[PDB]
Design a protein around this ligand. Structure first.
Ligand code: CYZ
Ligand code: GLU
Ligand code: ZN
Length: 259
């Protein structure tokens, strides 16, 4: 019996620092959907755990050339963490190196715009040039475009990869701030979950437009062949069927809505 090392990321409303975290210790310093989920997964699987924020603040991508994985995926692949409980997207390239539980939350790539922006779809973005658009560095959303075969998406990637100054951002907050401060000249491509969350946060000046570009979900990840895999997957199913996952999404997304 050993304390499970949990890697996660500071991303609202999944994991956030508590107001007086400086006066708290260990897992008590954090709050959010994934903090709540972590406690439940651990309780049902019967293990003690320690939440740790991923060092490089990234989700996970493999550097072409160096072939080294960064972010939470990296912490799992190189043995720094035993499990990842965060808004980590299930993708083929990742499932080839780590294991994923069935999804605990659904999402799709979506468009965030400053209210009033002349955009209603991805096709709209790909057909104009006045409004710039980008995605998060090191994420599944960037990969989606980099490897998309679909016309509208291949065209969009071609623009984004060559846009100057860079249309990519280091963090979701950076993307959101760019939308809010660009007077409608910047649209941000991000997962519906984050988009929906920000839409219910003051100043209530952003909006999700159009339908989602794809359909996927977040899963709890473990190193390939881990002993925790089975139990965690069963826990996710149990918690999903008992309605806890829905309860947690409402608690962190809409129950505390500010708009
Ligand atoms: N509506 S939501 O995003 O909070 C949400 C999304 C999903 C849930 C449960 C909730 Cl509450 N459960 C499923 C899980 C239950 C089983 C059927 C599909 C997987 C395994 N995942 S999902 O379809 O990605
Ligand atoms: N959830 C994504 C990060 C957010 C994004 O790429 O938009 C991932 O696991 O890479
Ligand atoms: Zn429970």
């Amino acid at each position: 019996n050993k304390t499970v090392v949990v890697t996660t990321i500071l991303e609202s409303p999944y994991v956030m620092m508590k107001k007086n975290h400086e006066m708290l210790e260990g897992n008590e310093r954090y709050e959010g959907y994934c903090v709540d989920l972590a406690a439940e997964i651990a309780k049902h699987c019967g293990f003690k755990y320690k939440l740790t924020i991923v060092g490089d603040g990234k989700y996970g991508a493999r550097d072409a050339d160096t072939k080294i994985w960064n972010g939470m995926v990296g912490e799992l692949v190189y043995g720094k963490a035993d499990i990842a409980i965060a808004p980590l997207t299930i993708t083929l390239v990742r499932e080839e190196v780590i294991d994923f539980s069935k999804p605990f939350m659904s999402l799709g790539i979506s468009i965030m715009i400053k209210k009033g922006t002349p955009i209603e779809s991805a096709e709209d973005l790909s057909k104009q040039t006045e409004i710039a658009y980008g995605t998060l560095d090191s994420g599944s959303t960037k990969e989606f475009f980099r490897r998309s075969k679909i016309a509208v998406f291949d065209k969009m990637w071609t623009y984004m990869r060559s846009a100057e100054p860079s249309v990519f951002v280091r963090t979701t907050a950076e993307g959101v701030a760019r939308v809010r401060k660009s007077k409608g000249k910047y649209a941000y491509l991000l997962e519906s979950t984050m988009n929906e969350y920000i839409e219910q946060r003051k100043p209530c000046d952003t909006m999700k437009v159009g339908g989602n570009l794809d359909s996927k979900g977040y899963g709890i990840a473990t190193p390939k062949g881990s002993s925790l895999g089975n139990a965690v997957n069963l826990a996710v199913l149990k918690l999903s069927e008992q309605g806890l996952l829905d309860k947690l999404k409402n608690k962190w997304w809409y129950d505390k809505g500010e708009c």
